[PDB]
Design a protein around this ligand. Structure first.
Ligand SMILES: Cc1ccc(=S)n(O)c1
Ligand SMILES: [Zn+2]
Length: 257
């Protein structure tokens, strides 16, 4: 099945998921010179004061921090979005080296990692029905650069020892995703897809311009996770990013001058 190695990596995905070569795949390179300011964009509203985290899971491709999405508790709206999208989980993509790791790139620049806060459109009732719709998801993407530690990341980094291998999960309550946000909510937005199989084309991407800084020690701990299950040969969970895909007939809009 799919993964990020030589024989099952991104160049192979299209055989099981032909949408891999579809018309609105993600990620893409954001050419900042070509991304037009759109003064009709509303400010983004990120309302995470009532977020209820539940659990963290190593799913063999990344780790997901999961939220109770059974009530309107942590929602994204405004910006490019019509209506209300509810937070369901966040995860990251990262590199074996600080010079790569992000999925989106900015004028071909790769960041060390990229955080994806995944939300589903509440008009669709739940996640599973939302991913059958072309406007079912909104993913807020945030770049990570290596420098100063991100204090708000440390509770995630500290729990990783307990979910080293595929299939492991751990209780992960009372985690506040507000601590992962940069100061500015200036963003680029375009229509795309999940960046992992099934690669569904349901996503309004909202990618923040301002990265957060994490320490070298924080990212090194991400790289000690494993793609394999317990009792299998160790394969470090690194380079779980898909490269940039063709922009095709899409425009990237900027929320800022
Ligand atoms: C389930 C899910 C949703 C969004 C993304 S970017 N990934 O990678 C996975
Ligand atoms: Zn992702």
């Amino acid at each position: 099945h799919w993964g990020y190695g030589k024989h099952n990596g991104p160049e192979h995905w299209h055989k099981d998921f032909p949408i891999a070569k579809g018309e609105r795949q993600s990620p893409v390179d954001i050419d900042t010179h070509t991304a037009k300011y759109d003064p009709s964009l509303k400010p983004l509203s990120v309302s995470y004061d009532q977020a209820t985290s539940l659990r963290i899971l190593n799913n063999g491709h990344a780790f997901n921090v999961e939220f109770d999405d059974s009530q309107d508790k942590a929602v994204l709206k405004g910006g490019p979005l019509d209506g209300t999208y509810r937070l369901i989980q966040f995860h990251f993509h990262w590199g074996s080296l600080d010079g790569q790791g992000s999925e989106h790139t900015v004028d071909k620049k790769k960041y060390a990692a990229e955080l994806h806060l995944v939300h589903w459109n509440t008009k669709y009732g739940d996640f599973g029905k939302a991913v059958q719709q072309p406007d079912g998801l909104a993913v807020l993407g945030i770049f990570l650069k290596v420098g100063s530690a991100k204090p708000g990341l440390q509770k995630v980094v500290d729990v990783l020892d307990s979910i080293k291998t595929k299939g492991k999960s751990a209780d992960f309550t009372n985690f506040d995703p507000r601590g992962l946000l940069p100061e500015s909510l200036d963003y680029w937005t375009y229509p795309g897809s999940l960046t992992t199989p099934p690669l569904l084309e349901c996503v309004t991407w909202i990618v923040l311009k301002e990265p957060i800084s994490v320490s070298s020690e924080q990212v090194l701990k991400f790289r000690k996770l494993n793609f394999n299950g317990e009792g299998e040969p160790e394969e470090l969970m690194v380079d779980n990013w898909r490269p940039a895909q063709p922009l095709k007939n899409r425009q990237i809009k900027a929320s800022f001058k």
